């Protein structure tokens, strides 16, 4: 003779552009209930790419297409004539890397410090690592370790460049979601 | 440009008499789909305490009230004009112990072998253990370990009974679900 909201869960790997549903019902049939949905304690109302379907014994929350904004806790509250119960589940929208500043081919003078921007956006925030050809056919790629500093935002700083610093450089962006972003650029060094 | 059934799960602790739902939808909106539900590869059809609700972008399976028979794998199949996809989740209905043969007060002759039946039903199948008062006020209870054999089905066999075997005996039935079943009986031994 009690009232319990049946637990609901969102699927693990939800990504932007996909569809997300959530179903709220009671554990034992009561047939005298009403529903209300909330995001972070604030009530959700049926419009705006978020649609709430009300039925006799269940309610459906629908988010389509989902954006990164839709992350948060979603709560259903059931009211049956004397008592109200709730259940809350957390939705985390993920996204594969997207380009923000692509790297570029550069031609700079010997002895100069240069920066190569490779910044992306995604959830979780992607990791950027840089590799160099060290062979101009450009099939082999190796990691970088003296005058090469990768700044935390994915920018490669090459200090006091010389002819050996020429070659093909590739930055890789990955957060374990979707496909990785990759882009190769050539660095030329010249005497002024 | 593919078709994936969004995963669905049943709640952990489903018990007989409760209600069970399942929602089938696509990962990405397609709007050109149809639904069919199956239990153990055999199609479910809307009647008989199992009702299937069909809508434009989702379908709902409803089992209310659920019985132990309803355990099994439940599969939703979505068809969109060229391709069909599926998802399967396993439902296991549980139940607290219910009495099948309660123990009884017995009065038997010295030197006889007697059996005390304490058999229950439940899912998972419950464990039965026996305890003796060893004090007729009947507040303290202890386990049993020479002429006391508990047979695997919860029956307590007391061999060659004597006056010391008199007292209050209690069998306990538990499977970790709901409430345990308990029942105390008195054993009298007499000379013929
Ligand atoms: C989504 O929900 C999680 C946990 O789910 C529970 O939410 C809490 C508040 C209870 O209502 C439970 O019944 C729900 O199941 C939240 O994470 C919790 O946030 C609480 C903040 O109110 C934390 O409690 C605080 O803890 C400190 C330190 O002990 C204490 O001094 C405070 O008084 C206060 O009680 C709690 O520890 C959090 N637990 C976990 C597992 O995270 C989410 O809110 C929070 O999310 C975390 C990751 C941070 O970003 C917080 O800044 C944020 O408030 C909640 N999210 C939203 C959007 O509501
Ligand atoms: C090329 O890069 C080097 C070092 O790396 C720098 O990277 C640039 C892009 C900036 O992000 C800097 O903030 C990094 O440090 C520069 O040489 C460094 O210059 C710093 C000061 O301008 C030095 O810091 C000093 O170090 C002393 C001794 O260790 C310390 O006590 C002080 O706190 C002081 O801050 C730093 O040590 C230098 N690098 C190394 C490896 O020692 C280049 O610029 C500068 O070169 C220095 C030595 C001076 O002559 C400056 O006038 C000159 O601008 C930078 N640009 C070039 C080479 O054109
Ligand atoms: C409910 O589903 C589980 C597992 O879920 C999967 O079902 C299998 C068959 C695949 O379709 C997957 O894609 C689903 O996710 C079943 O458990 C499996 O049963 C299979 C029987 O066909 C087992 O495969 C067999 O394995 C032997 C030994 O390696 C092999 O030689 C055979 O050729 C055959 O491939 C498989 O190993 C099982 N896996 C697990 C994790 O249990 C359920 O069916 C089975 O349930 C088990 C507990 C036993 O009772 C079996 O007798 C029973 O068939 C399935 N239940 C129902 C009612 O369909
Ligand atoms: C009271 O219980 C004892 C032993 O426990 C029995 O429990 C009853 C309820 C039944 O489930 C039996 O199957 C259990 O064994 C009985 O005495 C046992 O009798 C068995 C044969 O009837 C003996 O098995 C034998 O043992 C020898 C030597 O070890 C072995 O080589 C053989 O294979 C042979 O099968 C068993 O050993 C006895 N118990 C003990 C502890 O040794 C009581 O009944 C019987 O008492 C025996 C000794 C004979 O006199 C039978 O004619 C008599 O019916 C049983 N009922 C009473 C005491 O009234």
Numbering used by the authors:
A (entry chain A), B (entry chain A): 1 to 145, 148 to 194
Give sentences copied directly from the paper behind this entry:
The trans interactions of Chelicerata sDscam were mediated exclusively through the Ig1 domain for both sDscamα and sDscamβ subfamilies. It is worth noting that sDscamβ subfamily has two variable Ig domains, Ig1 and Ig2. The crystal structures of sDscam Ig1 from both M. martensii and L. polyphemus revealed a common assembly of antiparallel homodimer for both α and β subfamilies of sDscam. Similarly, sDscam Ig1 also employs the ABED face to form an antiparallel homodimer. However, among the seven Ig1 structures reported here, the complementary electrostatic potential surface pattern (negative in one end, neutral in the middle, and positive in the other end) has been only observed in the three β isoforms, but not in any one of the four α isoforms.
Recently, a shortened Dscam (sDscam) gene family with tandemly arrayed 5′ cassettes in Chelicerata species has been identified, which encodes ∼50–100 isoforms. Chelicerata sDscams could be classified into two subfamilies, sDscamα and sDscamβ, containing one and two variable Ig domains, respectively. Crystal structures and cell aggregation assays demonstrated that both α and β subfamilies of sDscam used Ig1 for the isoform-specific trans recognition in a hand-in-hand manner. Furthermore, the cis interactions were established by the three FNIII domains of sDscam, which assemble into a cross fold with a kink between FNIII2 and FNIII3.
